Amino acid sequence: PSRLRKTRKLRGHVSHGHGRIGKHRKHPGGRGNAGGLHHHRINFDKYHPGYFGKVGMKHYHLKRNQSFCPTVNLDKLWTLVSEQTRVNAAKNKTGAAPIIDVVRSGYYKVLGKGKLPKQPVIVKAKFFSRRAEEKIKSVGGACVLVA
Amino acid sequence: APSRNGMVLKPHFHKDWQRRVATWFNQPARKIRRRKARQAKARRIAPRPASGPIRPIVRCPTVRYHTKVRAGRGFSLEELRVAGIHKKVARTIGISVDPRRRNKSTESLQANVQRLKEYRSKLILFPRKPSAPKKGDSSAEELKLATQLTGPVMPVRNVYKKEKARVITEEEKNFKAFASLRMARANARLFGIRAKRAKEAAEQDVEKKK
RNA sequence: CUAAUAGGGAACGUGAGCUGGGUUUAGACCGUCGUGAGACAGGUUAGUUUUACCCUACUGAUGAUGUGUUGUUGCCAUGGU
RNA sequence: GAGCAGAAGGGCAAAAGCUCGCUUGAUCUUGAUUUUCAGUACGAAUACAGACCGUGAAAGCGGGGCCUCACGAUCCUUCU
RNA sequence: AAUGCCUCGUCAUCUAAUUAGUGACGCGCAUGAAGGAUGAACGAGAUUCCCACUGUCCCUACCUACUAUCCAGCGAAACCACAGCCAAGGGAACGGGCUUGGCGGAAUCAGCGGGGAAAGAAGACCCUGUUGAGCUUGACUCUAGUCUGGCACGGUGAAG
RNA sequence: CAGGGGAAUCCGACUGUUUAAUUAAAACAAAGCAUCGCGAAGGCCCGCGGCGGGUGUUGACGCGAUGUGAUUUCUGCCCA
RNA sequence: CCCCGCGGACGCUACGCCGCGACGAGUAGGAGGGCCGCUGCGGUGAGCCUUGAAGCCUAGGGCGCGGGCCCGGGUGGAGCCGCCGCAGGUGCAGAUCUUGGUGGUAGUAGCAAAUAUUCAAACGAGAACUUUGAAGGCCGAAGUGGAGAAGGGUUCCAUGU
RNA sequence: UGGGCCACUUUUGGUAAGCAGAACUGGCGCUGCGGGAUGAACCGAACGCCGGGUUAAGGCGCCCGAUGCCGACGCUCAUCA
RNA sequence: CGACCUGGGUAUAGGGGCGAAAGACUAAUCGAACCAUCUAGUAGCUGGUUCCCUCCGAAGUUUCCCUCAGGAUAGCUGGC
RNA sequence: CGGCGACGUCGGCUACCCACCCGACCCGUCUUGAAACACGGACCAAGGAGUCUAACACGUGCGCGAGUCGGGGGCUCGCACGAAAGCCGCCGUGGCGCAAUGAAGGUGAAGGCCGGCGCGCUCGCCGGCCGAGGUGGGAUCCCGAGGCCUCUCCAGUCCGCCGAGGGCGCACCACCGGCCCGUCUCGCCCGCCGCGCCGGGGAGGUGGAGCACGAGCGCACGUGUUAGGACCCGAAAGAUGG
RNA sequence: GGGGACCGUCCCCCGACCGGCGACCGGCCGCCGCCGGGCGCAUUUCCACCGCGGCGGUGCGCCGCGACCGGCUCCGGGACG
RNA sequence: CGCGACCUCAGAUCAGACGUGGCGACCCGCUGAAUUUAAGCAUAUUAGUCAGCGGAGGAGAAGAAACUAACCAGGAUUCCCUCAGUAACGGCGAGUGAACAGGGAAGAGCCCAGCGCCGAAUCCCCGCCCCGCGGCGGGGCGCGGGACAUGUGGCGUACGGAAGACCCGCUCCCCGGCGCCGCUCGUGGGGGGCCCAAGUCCUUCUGAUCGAGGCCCAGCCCGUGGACGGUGUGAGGCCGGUAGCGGCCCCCGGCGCGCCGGGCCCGGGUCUUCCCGGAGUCGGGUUGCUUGGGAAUGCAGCCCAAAGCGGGUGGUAAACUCCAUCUAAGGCUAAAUACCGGCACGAGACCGAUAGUCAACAAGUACCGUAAGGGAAAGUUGAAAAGAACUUUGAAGAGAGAGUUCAAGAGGGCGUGAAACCGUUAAGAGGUAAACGGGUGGGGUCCGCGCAGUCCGCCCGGAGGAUUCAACCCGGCGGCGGGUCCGGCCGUGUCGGCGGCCCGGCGGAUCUUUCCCGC
């Protein structure tokens, strides 16, 4: 809505909010990111450190599918299966542990943030972290690798 | 000129973009035109499936999608060979065939020939001359049972094997998943240089012993 | 020569007053400087000087207000000198 | 009232000056801080901490010059 | 000297009087030899003097034609914040307006050139702009053309 | 109808030409003098290109490129 | 246990109403409110209107701090507005602004290059200018004469206005 | 916004300047009002629309509100006060 | 009477022509014609920038910049 | 409490004209400073200048919420409106968020208390619990001795208010610990189909746009910055083709 | 692959107990109110008119006067310490 | 020193055909800047863009891998979403910048050369006869010509192919036609033509009305039609239209059956024996351009110049090695996609005559320039011309009367008719240019139903009228309350789940045949 804007309130004020001394001119200072090393250097250094220069090795023809490895933490591991899977295993008299295949749910790596409830579980994944495997074995579970 | 905190923005509007602007006001009309052409085509091929030929089961290429299965371009020639279908008769009875696709494994190959057998069993073949049925199909199976199938023929679904909960064995609890991954990476990294060093040590051993 | 040939101001009074000799465009010559284009509070020659009918000022010319109209003869405020 | 390399100012006497003896702390490192300052950088400087050393009988002192000056981004190159 | 700053050089001559002219001199700021120096004729070229001639002047006057002027008819434009009498003050340091004073009397005609810092043109002088263009070169970076080497078209014989 | 004249100085030899719309000149041109290149597979020049084109229907008493500027008289020294 | 009385103002769009205290300059600039204004769309006003819409004019009556608005009179002759939302090519004194129109100047400058006109008559409503006649003059054969080229294109010639 | 400027006082260059350059506070710029006749900055005082009272700075012959007080004490005569 | 004046026909076209040379002339345009387009070229520079009331209310200073008629930056401002 | 009232008077005036006293220079603009002898403006009418797109940032409103979003496609008499609306869910592909850090190879965020043991060696095998530590502040909330009442009292019946002190402490702030990735220094252990120039672990510093019980996504609106003709008008120029 | 069982939600029912009849509704009662029709037909009730009537509210068509009270303010007398 | 055959050339107004030029919005091939940004500027950017040249079509181009990948692999091209403002390029500055995978729209595949076999099996032309004319074919004939072994046709093309055997299946294609089709298919297929509901009812307004009231019946009449336009206002019913899987007439076209006629010719599996490929091209060097392509992505010039278990690619130059993947240097191909030109339509929160196209109109017109080119202004009487007969003054323009009209205070640039500016009339004023702010005063024009001044509640008194008041009865309707008085219920639990995988659903990353159809 153009009726809610400052231009309706600036009718009758000669400078339109841009001043009488400095006026509103075309491009004082340059166009775009002009002069980022000369007369806008303070702004670029203050808010964008690291902007200028090269760092690291360049790699031609990056295929992002090769490095596709979504990760899931331990605190969300039991959300990949139904609540019925969880409650049946908890009240199970035998030592049967459900299998959570994180690859089926769309994750490849199991990271170890958080804590697990105290009941065994078999976790299928492409990759595990050291602490994720340690906590899974702590609750009596097992880590099994898939490809 | 930059002003306080902000993002360094690089718009790509330095190249007379206003002369090449694609508006989409004909989008609702294009959807109507496509829909009418779809309906007209389905009427043209009267009892044949409206979507088109049956497509094979195909696994998606990369490591991002190899857990997923979709529909391919056409059945390979090895699949048709063991399904007993001529590669020139297949297209006339609604089987798409891709002569440039090979079969690296027998699991996907056998899954597609089961697909062809099931389609061939579901197929109602009208006689070429309706007065004289030669080898096509009984008149009862096509009197009213022949309808135009809608959607993809036998749509491809991602099946998931359900794993029953089992007692964890003692050997499973002793498997070191992180150590196995670290050692597998190191073994593949150092396989070549270990083979060179072993060969070089063999060179030094034989020359010393001689 | 004369009594004397005092010094000055007025947008260094005064260019819709003039003139245009000078300076101060474009042509050209000389000296000096510069590789050169070119330059010279150096010299020299040739080089378009537009408009007033408006307002005021001023100069003159009719008139105007008040004595009822109109005319003759007059006075002198004031200004100049 | 001399000298301390140099401009000037400060400082300094069994010193910081002069002469000897031994040396390489003018080395390897991570942060913090001060100075200019926007509390950005560079340069310079201060106080530590961890090595490895020097010197001295030792306490200690020393990571350059008694202090205040003596200097230099991105990109590229070159060496380790 | 169309070339000399000092300089209106110094001497002579021309005049009553000459920063002018001519002749002469020459350590010549900074003359000078494909241009130097002469020399008739020529020149809408620059300069000085003399005779004659005259309103250029003393020193203005008079006359003639066309205007201007007045009239009938016809009929613009420039320009215009508002306007239009001054002295002083203060003020963007030179007012038509403001302050203080002087004062102020309709509507006009012919003139006039003091003012309106009159009009005409977004100063051409001067500076600034990370605005140009014409030209030059011992600026930077290129380039047509040219010189040169190599390969190919490109072959057959001999002497070195 | 229809020249004022004379004595000189500077410049340009003269006649010619020139900035249409501020400069008619002492400027340009000029004859004369001098220098340079070239014998044609060439000199100088045009051309995006063609063994293209101009000089050239030419040939050194010619063509091309410069400087100075009639006559007279001279045109000195210097190749760092 | 109110009852011879059967009764008792207003209020409180709560985005409303009421009370008390202090305060009020403003360029550049920012913010809020606008029952200020223009145009169009969705709703709504059982809206207005040929018994007279819009627009315009008005020494008419008023309201509001203001932007503005309402009403009377006249002209006009066919459409228009209020409220809740929505959307803008949405508000002018300037820009040596654009286009159009109009003033003062001003009945002014001006209608002054090449010697020159005058008398009578006719036609005609009307004659300095037309036509005829009579004079006086000019071009003066390198013409103000007689013919062509280029260019123009019917200007040629009659008749009429 | 990143042109500042002015005044008391301190203060540098300059003969000085309504000059140029600093420090401090205030002001003008952005600000009207009373007074200084007049005036960006001085003196008083800062501002919604008004009535009454009283003041500031400044005044009270007349312009021009207010001494038209029987004001007090002296000083001063200028033919540029 | 000549390097004379002139008609018509031809040739040369824009970084080109043509010039007895003045940067002259090339259709009132010439130190690079005219026409259309790129193009609404760019401008730290000049001019303008349209209704009302209420509330708050500055800066001409710091640092850096081929920076000095401009910006970034801190400061001062307003709003939530 | 008085007077006065229809063809003459009564009241009114913002509005029309005129007179007088005081005050009053012409607006816009740049500017330290304009009435300026600074520029634009003769007059009137109509037109006339911060826009739209994209991308960010923050604020605000709305829906859903560890998710969110169909925008591309498809299905629905193909169509007045309707080019709308509705729906899809094995159309969520995908985007953004949910994980960071390193140039990369890669790695990748749970501790606290009570116990027996090797040696409770700065510590390794477990047990049991609990589930992001602690300090100082901290809105709110909870307890609360003691008071506050009636016509009065010996003696409790029900709850309301004030209340010194005490307690649990939201968000947030300061600080101290802890965890993850990079990089140093020191050091000793552990693993085994590959006994390795293999893999893992510890302590103490330090670098990170991190963790430490999520807050995002989509839509709308506003403001600011930017690229675009970019608030409007304005060069001297440059290029292409005639 | 089908068919089952189980779990989680649901959608209807067969019944009771619990809180309510509610802002989900009807029937009976009880109270109250209104309306219509009878009866009540006159010291009641209502309607309209008159008094230059009174008590209230508001307000005088215009122009004016006075009084006392209160707020603020400028003055003047008188008296006491 | 002649005649023939061939080869290579030439001429012809030879017989029959074809091309040229236009448009050019979209498409293909080239060529190709600078303004601009970088706060200067040269690389870069603008931009492979404007301008320039050529070539097409209803689409074009592309296109069936010398591909992507590195996976558990996908599988022509084109388009959309996403990848992604990413990898990368870049005075690593300003800036630039794809692809793969994934999801969709669409979906379609093929043909030669070569190697071989088959008596050149092949093709064009000219005559003759017949069936038909429609994009000129068929059939037959010609000791009729020519092309062609310097290679036509059939088979066949990397997905392998061919020939023989052996076995199995006889399976059935295309085209032109007669009669009729069902007739086509979101409801005939398309084009053209002609038609199809209901008020001009009563009373009124007006110049004219389509306006305003009314039309008892459940409501004037029709409505599958209440879109729109015209008509003297503003109309569902006055007219054209609108609605309708409405009607009638004519023409054209694409799907079958019975039949006609013509061509029309073997397919698969196994075994054996054979056969297999595009060269001044790839590739390398160098140069210039181009790209995100970075020790060189693509393109081109010049030089070098291949191979055959080879060659290309495998995003860092090189050697060795393994592996993967394709098969270049020949060709065709629909769909999805594009479309500011054209033909014909529909619509709009757009503009409303200085706006919107330059152009609402005799507009690319008038006019300007030698030319390339530049380029306007300009809409409105009235319902109907009923467009002012006639008289009169004047030479006429122009007037005064008269007349038409609802209106000429609508009179042919004529709807309305502002401001600036001007004339006249009326009022007021005038020597400090006008104009303005504050305060009064005077005059004037209007306004006030001004001119004896409000009103209304209760009470008192006076004189009058009356469906006449309270209380009771009958009926109707409400409001409030009632242990639930009675139902109907509502929330929360609460049990047999009798009741729902038959006799109720939807789900579940929960278990199973241990009854059932696929190893």
Ligand SMILES: [Mg+2]
């Ligand atoms: Mg303001």
Ligand SMILES: [Mg+2]
């Ligand atoms: Mg303005």
Ligand SMILES: [Mg+2]
């Ligand atoms: Mg710099």
Ligand SMILES: [Mg+2]
């Ligand atoms: Mg003077």
Ligand SMILES: [Mg+2]
């Ligand atoms: Mg003059």
Ligand SMILES: [Mg+2]
């Ligand atoms: Mg003068």
Ligand SMILES: [Mg+2]
């Ligand atoms: Mg002169």
Ligand SMILES: [Mg+2]
């Ligand atoms: Mg000159």
Ligand SMILES: [Mg+2]
């Ligand atoms: Mg020289």
Ligand SMILES: [Mg+2]
């Ligand atoms: Mg002259």
Ligand SMILES: [Mg+2]
């Ligand atoms: Mg006198």
Ligand SMILES: [Mg+2]
């Ligand atoms: Mg140390």
Ligand SMILES: [Mg+2]
């Ligand atoms: Mg030291």
Ligand SMILES: [Mg+2]
């Ligand atoms: Mg001289």
Ligand SMILES: [Mg+2]
């Ligand atoms: Mg003399």
Ligand SMILES: [Mg+2]
């Ligand atoms: Mg002499």
